[PDB]
Amino acid sequence: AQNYFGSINISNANVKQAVWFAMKEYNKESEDKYVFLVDKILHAKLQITDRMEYQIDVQISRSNCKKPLNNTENCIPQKKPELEKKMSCSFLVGALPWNGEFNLLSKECKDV
């Protein structure tokens, strides 16, 4: 049905910043002991209202990095089968990206 969301390039620096922001907040809010990182950015859509709203679909996986990330470098996807975890997530990120203002409005993740 009709809405005011339009597909947007995933190349866009603001989409990448929206994903950076969403994943920072996802990890802070999650009850998992491990950091999830981005396997792939799958799709992005933009709604223009009083703010910019990015609806972003990402594939994320459980890393071998324990929260909090701190200065840990080269986190890799879990290699232990019992800890391997892949999810498809949809994030709704509100922004005035020209003002560096981002807000995670909604999250939904499913196992894949």
Is 3 or 31 the residue whose CB approaches a copy of itself more closely?
3
> Footprint of Cl ion on residues 91-110 (CB under 5 A)?
94, 96, 99, 101, 103, 109
Return the residue of 41, 59, 75, 85 that touches Cl ion, per CB under 5 A.
Answer: 41
The listed partner (Na ion, a copy of itself, Cl ion, none) that binds 29, CB under 5 to 8 Å by sort, is none
Q: Structure tokens of 17? A: 């910043």
Using CA of residue 49, residue 22, residue 15, residue 44, what is the dihedral sign?
negative
Q: Which does 33 bind (CB under 5 to 8 A by kind): Na ion, Cl ion, a copy of itself, none?
A: Cl ion
Which of the residues 48 through 67 are near Cl ion (CB under 5 A)?
A: 51
| Backbone region of residue 55 per phi and psi (left: phi > 0; alpha: psi in -120 to 50; beta: other values) | beta
**CB-CB contact of 82 with 19 (8 Å):** no
CA 44, 27, 38, 20 dihedral sign is positive
Shortest gap between Cβ of 36 and a copy of itself (angstroms)?
10
Residue whose pair of structure tokens reads 């929206």 in the numeric block: 18
Write down the least CB distance from residue 83 to a copy of itself, Å.
14
- Nearest approach in angstroms of CB 6 to Na ion is 6
